[PDB]
Amino acid sequence: RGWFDVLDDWLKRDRFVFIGWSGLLLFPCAFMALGGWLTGTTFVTSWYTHGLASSYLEGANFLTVAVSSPADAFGHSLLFLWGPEAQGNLTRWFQIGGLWPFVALHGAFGLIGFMLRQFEISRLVGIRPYNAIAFSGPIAVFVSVFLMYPLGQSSWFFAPSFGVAGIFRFILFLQGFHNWTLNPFHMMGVAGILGGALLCAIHGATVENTLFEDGEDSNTFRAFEPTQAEETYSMVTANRFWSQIFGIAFSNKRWLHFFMLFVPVTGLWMSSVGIVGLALNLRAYDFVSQELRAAEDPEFETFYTKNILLNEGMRAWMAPQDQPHENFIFPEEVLPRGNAL
Amino acid sequence: NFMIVFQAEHNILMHPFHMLGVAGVFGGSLFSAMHGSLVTSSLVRETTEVESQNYGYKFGQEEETYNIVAAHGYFGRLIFQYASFNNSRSLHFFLGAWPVIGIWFTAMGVSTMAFNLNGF
Amino acid sequence: MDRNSNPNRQPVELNRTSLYLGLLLVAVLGILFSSYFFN
Amino acid sequence: MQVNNLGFIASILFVLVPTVFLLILFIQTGK
């Protein structure tokens, strides 16, 4: 037995936490990313990068702590602890936002490790690897949003911060500056996510309400056995119900479950494509025909133009605080605003 | 427009019921993807490599079309044994309950922000 | 040289449900993207 | 409205071509 086979045997032992070869990448990187996030949200400020308190130590709460993006001055520097910025100084590395690339890169490699784990375990137990394929969607989201978007922009500063309110800020930023809601790729993402939730709810309810009477208890949960060969709910009854209620119904179980995979995954992939577009400011910001008409016709008003006005307001009022490195000085009189407000 | 004004006036993003709605829909999509992928992954071989695997299932067939035990083995090794459902009925109840509860909470969030009890 | 029948050729199929699903997908994609095509 | 002069052709083809692809495949099915 060669040493490689012996190692392979040890890594793939049946234990409470499977390790595998993929574990060598997953567990250290995932632990680094998680511990980095926890450390930053507990102890680390964003005073020098954003002028914000972002840790429990500073008095922030769960909703307002974040591992904030690094200072815009560094561009897309990877900000290694040993890099030319921190130069091995851990305190300075924390202060310049070095924890953000730490978490982002370790999380990217952890995600790779987790999907490799899906592949490895699928191969070991002898099933098709569709779980890894489904997980490609979250990977596309993470790559586009946390890497490609800031890479197309001026710096990592404009990446989403790892935090609840940081993410909320990123969301509102994308609305105001990119008109992200108007983006058809985002609308396909929304369709996929809401459709996935709908499919989850409707399938769970349909199964639970077409169950066969296989026990005597009012508690129907123990009238199932994992090794039983027969279906536990009536597909025929479900199909008739949905055909008469909704007009159409699934008749193929396999197609049903592939659809439940397909819808949210495609939603994630389409939204990731849209985010890639936004990385280069290739926005679906305006409808030029309506802009031109409004510019020449002061009685043409649509919900689109109203939303454009909202975006202008958000940008002007938010930019000085959101982008402190720019030293934006917008005097009170240049701020757009409606009457009396 | 409705959503943007709503956020401006109620801070719905910082409302825990809307956070529960987001958990509802994100998690519902997550569980839809997992359930579909685990069932598709554990399909019993009934077709050839040419035809769609969907033809391996016949409408109204009594037998099970996938191996739930193999799906449980895979998932309980992906995370750990006791986090994996092996009872299809409990699994499907969870699939129904998660998005429904999340959406109930977010509906109540909007309904209570209707009375200007706003987000944090 | 001789022209010999290729034994790797296979029929393609699209069942009626697949047709309805594809037609709906195409129609809704058109609905979605037409506004942006017109701009 | 001053819309893109390629909008009609783009939208019509965007719908039409996949439509005839599906129609061809469906109609020939079972041959």
Partner: peptide
């Protein structure tokens, strides 16, 4: 005249719905 295009695509989707309901492939138990 882009109104015509919008109406056209919407009508296409609706017609697909009616045919998918009325002229669906019947589920058959066999």
């Amino acid at each position: 005249m882009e109104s015509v295009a919008y109406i056209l695509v919407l009508t296409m989707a609706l017609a697909v719905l009616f045919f998918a309901i009325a002229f669906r492939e019947p589920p058959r138990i066999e």
